[PDB]
């Protein structure tokens, strides 16, 4: 049971503009674009004071569109809150009672979770809080565990993310979280096992999810978790270590920045991304075999060949997939190094895996006969070849889309086959 999480920077969704940035660039992705295979999304949102109205459209879309759509895909969502939030528990006396802890836990869940249609919570603790703070945080976390996390009896996640191994705020309430999200941006599996060992008294490796980042625009820090050769990048090392040592999985920060750099062009720009590194990391963490990856890649290349006019690029991609030695290479053969540089910008290995179950052989032979008829176009009547061409191009465009169903494939088979049976001469 592996997890793959992502911290979705809310202010980089299309529904936001001018929130938490000074860059006039338009955002390029929505939450619909989050790749398949990610089972936990952390709606990570920070709104500078005075911009709440600008971020409200995103929250509305999240509650009414993104969250239902991602729930339909089996994805659970969590909200990222500061650890200090837990410290704001109201109480009358010198220390909060059990009832006051419960009241503030329900308050947090209504404020940050239920009011957005989201499932769970994520506590971002990058501090060294004192014993006084930890009393309150322990009370609040234990109260929350009644409604979210393992001790709640529900599917709702309760996560604890940190970049260090300060145990005091975690040792007394460790069993209330589904897993700990360890941020190790710019570090490989050595820091991973170092932190695992330092967290051993309070956390088992199976509930330890290491995570890396992509370069954030205008960032003062410099975390290099991507690089070629792929097998020398921190992403490969951490993913393969997580799979090999049966860790809880892996997470990534700033999904929108997949494939970006700190170069002056990327540092001050918002650009689209083929999400190559994210999908590769999902596969590497899950332990996908190279045969599986190649099969999915070839299925995708076959179902887009009817709509793609670049036969040379098709041949090159197919050959590279066959000659690929790593999952990264199989994904890059289709996606390319960067957005637009590939035969496709949206190929998703997990989505394609889901599609594998649908048989396309009938549709494929029908489309091949249609292509043969279009090749001998001068030999039929135009009034009928034009029906065939319109139907074939429409079916090929639809077949190369993001997803399809068995019923749609049946309809397309019927349409192409009718168009074929109606050719004159
Ligand atoms: C999990 C993780 O990856 N954590 C951090 C990353 O956040 C951090 O990236 C940067 O994050 C800031 C946003 O961080 C602030 O808000 C976080 C989310 O909580 C907010 O919303 C909650 C719910 O409404 C509120 O309860 C909360 O108060 C807050 O408003 C919050 O978790 C975070 O707090 C952590 O860090 C502080 C110290 O800074 C610590 O005291 C806390 O205890 C806690 O651990 C912050 O309060 C985001 O604004 C940054 O993005 C800008 O800058 C980048 C360039 O760096 C631009 O690309 C981008 O366009 C924005 O202009 C950035 O994403 C990374 C380091 O970058 O480190 C991780 O560990």
Describe the structure.
- The PDB classes it as hydrolase.
- The entry lists the keywords glycan, antibody.
- It forms a monomeric assembly.
- The entry is titled "Crystal structure of Endoglycosidase E GH18 domain from Enterococcus faecalis in complex with Man5 product".
- Helix 3 (98-112) packs across helix 4 and helix 10 (290-304) packs antiparallel against helix 11 (311-322).
- The radius of gyration is 25 Å and the shape is elongated.
- Strand 6, helix 6 (189-198) and strand 7 form a beta-alpha-beta unit.
- The chain starts with a strand and ends with a helix.
- The longest helix is centred in the N-terminal third of the chain and has 21 residues, at 52-72.
- The chain has helices spanning 52-72, 83-87, 98-112, 131-144, 168-171, 189-198, 234-244, 264-267, 276-286, 290-304, 311-322, 327-335, 349-355, 361-375, 382-399, 406-421, and strands at residues 3-9, 40-44, 76-82, 120-124, 158-162, 179-183, 208-213, 249-253.
- The protein has a domain at 3-286: Alpha-Beta Barrel (TIM Barrel), CATH 3.20.20.
- The chain has 425 residues and is α/β, with parallel strands linked by helices.
- The protein binds a molecule of 6 linked components (NAG-BMA-MAN-MAN-MAN-MAN).
- The site of a molecule of 6 linked components (NAG-BMA-MAN-MAN-MAN-MAN) has 25 residues, from strand 3 and helix 2.
- Residues 7, 20-21, 45-46, 80-85, 112, 124-127, 161, 163, 183, 216-219, 221, 253 line the site of a molecule of 6 linked components (NAG-BMA-MAN-MAN-MAN-MAN).
